[PDB]
Each structure stands twice: as C-alpha cells, then as structure tokens.
Chain A
Amino acid sequence: ATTNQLIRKGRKTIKEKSKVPALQACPQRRGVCTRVYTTTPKKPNSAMRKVCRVRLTSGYE
C-alpha cells in the first residue's frame, strides 16, 4: 500500500456482528418456553443437557 493507494482506497475494518442476535443488544430478554427437552452434547462429552426452546419478545425462537 503506497500513500496514494491508501488515499484512493483507505483501509476498512469489518465490524463483526453480535453473537447474541436474539437479545437485540439487551442484557436479558423475556420469552415463553415453547419446548423443554434434553439433548446430547458434542463429540468429547456425554450427558443429557437440559435445554428449552423459547420464543422471546424480540420475535426470535
């Protein structure tokens, strides 16, 4: 990158999106539990992890 190249183009940073889109930049969010079940974990571990599919006030499920 020459100086002329930096002026003509300019270095841009990509802004990464949030890892918690369903919260909508809120600390917590209220939802209703649409399904309470258990599931198996990934390869190394073995258990019955307790999970709930919940539809939140933001419209996510």
Chain B
Amino acid sequence: MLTNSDREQIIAQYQRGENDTGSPEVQVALLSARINDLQNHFKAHKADHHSRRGLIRMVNTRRKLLDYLKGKDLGRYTTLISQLGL
C-alpha cells in the first residue's frame, strides 16, 4: 500500500493551498496513486472480489470528484487530468 511518506509527497505536489489535503486535486491524486498501487495486488489475487469492491468505490469517488472539477473550473480539471494522465 501507500505509506505516509509518499502520501505526503502526493499531497505536497498537488497542494492547492497550505496544508489543505482536501481539494479535488489532492483527493484525485491520492486516489490515482492508490488505484495504481492496488493494480499490483489485483494482478496477483484476481479472485479477490471483496477488495475489488473497495477499489471500484475509489474509482467511483475519483470520477465524481473529476466531474465536480469539470463543472467548477474547466481549465483546472484539464490541467489536473493532464498531470495525472487520465
């Protein structure tokens, strides 16, 4: 899984303001890191349906946050998906 150190690295890279950790950008970046990290676990345990439910949930939450950004600030959404490669 992600550690506290790399979680804080992601937060510091996608900071909107000082120690915010709650904007759509930082939330989506943390979700993207966690999903890309869990892809490794699911390549090993593909029969894991109960954990895959939580993975699907964080995908859904990331999608909701990206829709909210698209409605809120279009350029901000475009730039954020440009860094995150989505």
A and B touch in the complex (CB under 8 A): no
**Chain A: residues with CB nearer than 8 A to chain B?**
none
- Report B's interface with A, CB cutoff 8 A: none
